[PDB]
Paper text:
[name] is composed of a bundle of three helices connected by loops and three additional helices. The first helix (H1) of the bundle is joined to the second helix (H2) through a disordered fourteen-residue loop. At the end of the H2 helix there are seventy residues in three smaller helices, a, b, and c, that form the connection to the third helix (H3). The “V-shape” of [name] is made up of the three-helix bundle and the three helices between the H2 and H3 helices, in the order H1-H2-a-b-c-H3. The H2 and H3 helices also make many contacts with each other and are linked by a conserved disulfide bond, Cys 49-Cys 159, that is observed in the electron density. We directly observed four of the seven cysteines and have evidence that six of the seven cysteines in [name] are in disulfide bonds. We reasoned that one cysteine had reacted with cystamine (the oxidized form of cysteamine) during protein refolding, which implied that there was one free cysteine in [name]. From comparisons with DBL domains, we concluded that Cys 51 is the single unpaired cysteine in [name] (see below). The three-helix bundle of [name] structurally matched each DBL C-terminal three-helix bundle, a region that has also been named “subdomain 3”. In the [name] crystal, pairs of molecules interact and bury 4300 Å2 of solvent accessible surface area between them.
Residue numbers in the entry:
A (entry chain A), B (entry chain A): 2 to 29, 44 to 167
The structure:
Amino acid sequence: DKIMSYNAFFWMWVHDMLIDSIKWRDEHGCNKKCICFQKWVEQKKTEWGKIKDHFRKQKDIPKDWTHDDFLQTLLMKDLLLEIIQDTYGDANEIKRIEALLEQAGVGGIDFAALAGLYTKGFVAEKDTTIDKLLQHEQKEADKCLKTHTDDT
Amino acid sequence: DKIMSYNAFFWMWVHDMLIDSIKWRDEHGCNKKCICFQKWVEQKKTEWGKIKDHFRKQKDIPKDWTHDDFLQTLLMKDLLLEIIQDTYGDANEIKRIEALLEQAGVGGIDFAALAGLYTKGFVAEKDTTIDKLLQHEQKEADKCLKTHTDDT
Ligand SMILES: [Cl-]
Ligand SMILES: [Cl-]
C-alpha cells in the first residue's frame, strides 16, 4: 500500500528520525532502556536501507527535463543569496537586502523547493549524514550495553 | 594587474553591490542625485558584464576532478540539513539537532564552501539575480529622471 509520495515521506522520515534520536539522548534499569534503543537503531537502519534501495531503483526514469534544469536555476539563486547572507552583515542588513530583492521581483531563499536534488543525488554518495548518525547511534548503544549490565 | 582571485573578488563585488543598492534607496536637488545614481547603475552593469565574460571564458578548464565531486557531496549534506532546518521545528529543536550531529561527527551547514558551484554554473543561466536587480535599478533611475526635472 502506497499511502503517500516517497518524496514527502522521505523528509518526514528523516525529520522524525532526528527528533527521535534527540529524545533518546534525554532518556539516557539503564539496560532495558538500552536494549530498546538498540532495537530502535536496528529498526531505523533497516528502514533507511530500504529508503536508499527505493531511491536507488527510481533513478532509471529519464523524465521531467525542464524540472531538473529549473532546479539548477533555483540552486544558483539560493546559493548566491545564502552565501552572501551567511558570510556578511547583521540581522538589519540581511533584512534590508531581502527587502531590496523582493522590491526588485526576486523571490527570497527557498531550499525546500530543491528537495528533489537531494533524493535524486544522495544515492550516488558513498556515505550519508543519516548513515553516519546511525553508526554513531549503534556505537552509543554498544557502549551502553557494555557498561550497564542489568539483565540478571 | 591581478590583485586577488576572481572567486574572492566576485563575492566581494556582489556583496558590495547589494549594500550600495540599499544605500541608494535611503538617499532617495533630487535630479543631480538621480543622474549620479543612473551613472552608477551603468557602471555596475558594465562591471557585471565583465564579471560574466570572465567566468564564461574560464569554463574551458577540465581541472580539479575530486573537488567538483567533493562539492556535490557537500551540497547533498547541506541541502538535507538546511531543508530540515527550514521546514521543521523551533530554535530549541534546530539547536538540539545541530548538537546531535556535531556529537556524531557531522559538520554543520556550510554553504560558503559551495561558492565554486555558483561561479561555475551562473554563466549557463539566461537571467541572474544581479541582472534582475540591475534592470530594476535602471527602471528606478528612469522613473526618477522622468518625475524629477531640475537641470535648468
Ligand atoms: Cl542567481
Ligand atoms: Cl547527506
